[PDB]
């Protein structure tokens, strides 16, 4: 049976003067109708029965509008999703370009559909489909804490690095390498110049703002807070949002806008660089090797992602937070399988480390577990080679997240 929404969309398509393309205004009206529909499955069935669903996909032309339409349908449909996907595939004969433009150039149109569909399902299942913002973004453009964690500026949206600087990076000009790398040397000195309130403000800014997502219309309404996504990932991986927050806050203090631009742009350049990207500074090859999107995307979609697509997803905050959390849980589980006798330097640095405790939740870990894991998150894990500075740096971030003024939904 027709729906109010199917009838409206059919009326608009039937009335449209051109049979190859609806107007931008007509398209925006169809997208709004789809997003406000209380019976999306029935609407999709109706449109597919009349032959109008394929027409809809064929006739909504500019890529930005196609992305909004497709992400909206993918994210709202359940029992009729396959019908929509099929109609979209049928439509692609006459539009090989589809959604595969701008920031989404590494996602084939059906891959875009599948990501949207899987992400919407995961946000509903794991509890991050909606969250009111409780923090506002920084306008910093240089220096420590001027990457996406502070600013909400997606790395994929940053201007192309100036031609002169791209060349210099390729040639390893020392000042330019510096400019586009980690901003901190002396980690303690940096923490020393932040007041206790400055520290809390950074944490609140980080977690309180909306995710910077590449798939906003996959969500029912506005994108959720980072804090919401971190709580969901903590529940999924038997961690705590405080631990996840500490790891990300440390990475983001040691992050700049320019580092974000290099991180992403190098990864999708002809070099396919193996950079650490986004909130948690996840390495491209690690995300692939350890299947770090397992809990947000199904296996067939994941196995089909190109390397540049994976790098692109690491720039979408929710994918990055889940990958970060999954990897923290990987490092902890791996730790639990080690022999402390074969880790004398680790024991020397973290003498109250308890390897078995890692298998359980961080609330029950010795503080030495958190310090050691921080070393083994920045560096290769459990090789008995430690980062001298990262443990204290993460431990201070953790102390901030354990302040009574930090609340997670």
């Amino acid at each position: 049976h027709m729906t109010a929404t199917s009838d409206l969309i059919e009326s608009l398509i039937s009335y449209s003067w051109d049979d190859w393309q609806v107007t931008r205004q007509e398209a925006r009206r169809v997208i709004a109708a789809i997003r406000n529909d209380n019976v999306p499955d029935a609407t999709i069935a109706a449109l597919d029965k009349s032959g109008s669903l394929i027409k809809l996909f064929q006739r909504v032309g500019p890529p930005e509008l196609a992305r909004s339409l497709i992400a909206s349908i993918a994210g709202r449909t359940t029992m009729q999703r396959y019908q929509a996907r099929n109609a979209l595939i049928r439509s692609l004969i006459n539009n090989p370009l589809g959604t595969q433009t701008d920031n989404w150039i590494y996602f084939p149109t059906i891959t875009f559909f599948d990501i949207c569909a899987d992400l919407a399902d995961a946000a509903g299942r794991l509890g991050f489909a909606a969250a009111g913002a409780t923090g506002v973004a920084s306008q910093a453009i240089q220096g420590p804490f001027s990457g996406v964690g502070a600013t909400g500026v997606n790395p994929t949206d940053l201007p192309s690095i100036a031609f002169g600087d791209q060349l210099k990076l390729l040639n390893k000009d020392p000042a330019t390498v510096t400019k586009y790398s980690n901003p901190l040397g002396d980690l303690g000195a940096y923490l020393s110049q932040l007041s206790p309130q400055d520290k809390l403000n950074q944490a609140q800014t980080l977690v309180g703002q909306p995710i910077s997502t590449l798939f906003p219309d996959a969500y029912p309404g506005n994108p959720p807070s980072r804090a919401k996504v971190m709580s969901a990932a903590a529940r999924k991986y038997d961690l705590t949002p405080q631990l996840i927050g500490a790891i990300i806050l440390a990475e983001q203090r040691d992050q700049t806008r320019d580092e974000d631009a290099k991180d992403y742009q190098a990864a999708v350049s002809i070099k396919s660089a193996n950079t650490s990207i986004g909130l948690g500074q996840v390495v491209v090859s690690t995300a692939i090797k350890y299947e770090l999107f397992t809990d947000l995307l199904g296996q067939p979609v994941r196995r089909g992602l190109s390397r540049k697509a994976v790098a692109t997803l690491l720039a979408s905050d929710e994918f990055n937070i889940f990958a970060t959390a999954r990897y923290i849980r990987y490092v902890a589980n791996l730790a639990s399988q080690q022999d402390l006798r074969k880790l004398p330097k680790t024991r020397g640095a973290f003498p109250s480390i308890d390897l078995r405790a890692y298998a359980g939740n961080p609330r029950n870990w010795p503080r030495d577990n958190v310090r050691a894991l921080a070393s083994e998150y920045t560096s290769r894990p459990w090789d008995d080679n430690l980062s001298p500075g990262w443990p204290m740096f993460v431990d201070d971030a953790y102390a901030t997240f354990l302040d009574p003024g930090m609340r997670f939904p």
């Binding site: 299942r125 509890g127 529940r235």
Partner: protein, 123 residues
């Protein structure tokens, strides 16, 4: 939609549906809709060693599949009685959800029961 995570000594782990009262059973958890409604939903989730009866309908559920059947029988003034029984594999074992409610307006979707099955797991 769901709140607390519940863990059975047999290794079944699941979440409690919001607004339902939970009790532990021999091989899992029983959920009964809260309050004192006329026509409450009732859900049970269990670990089971034996497979489902053969040749049941199949559907996609999350990223695997489930075998299921919905039965109907005479009810009362709130409608016919409907029951879902559905199972999915969990390693060499199975997880089963059964659910019931009445309806006078056709077969219930059992959306809540399907969601509970999807998120259940063994460890």
């Amino acid at each position: 939609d769901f709140d607390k995570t519940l863990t059975h000594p047999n290794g079944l782990v699941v979440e409690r549906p919001v607004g339902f009262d939970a009790r532990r059973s021999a091989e899992g958890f029983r959920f009964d809709e809260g309050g004192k409604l006329r026509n409450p939903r009732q859900l049970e989730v269990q670990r089971q060693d034996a497979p489902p009866p053969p040749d049941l309908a199949s559907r996609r559920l999350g990223d695997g599949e489930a075998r299921y059947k919905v039965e109907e029988d005479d009810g009362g003034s709130a409608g016919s009685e409907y029951r879902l029984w559905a199972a999915k594999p969990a390693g060499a074992r199975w997880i089963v959800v059964s659910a019931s409610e009445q309806s006078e307006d056709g077969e219930p979707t059992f959306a809540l029961a399907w969601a509970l099955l999807e998120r259940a797991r063994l460890q």
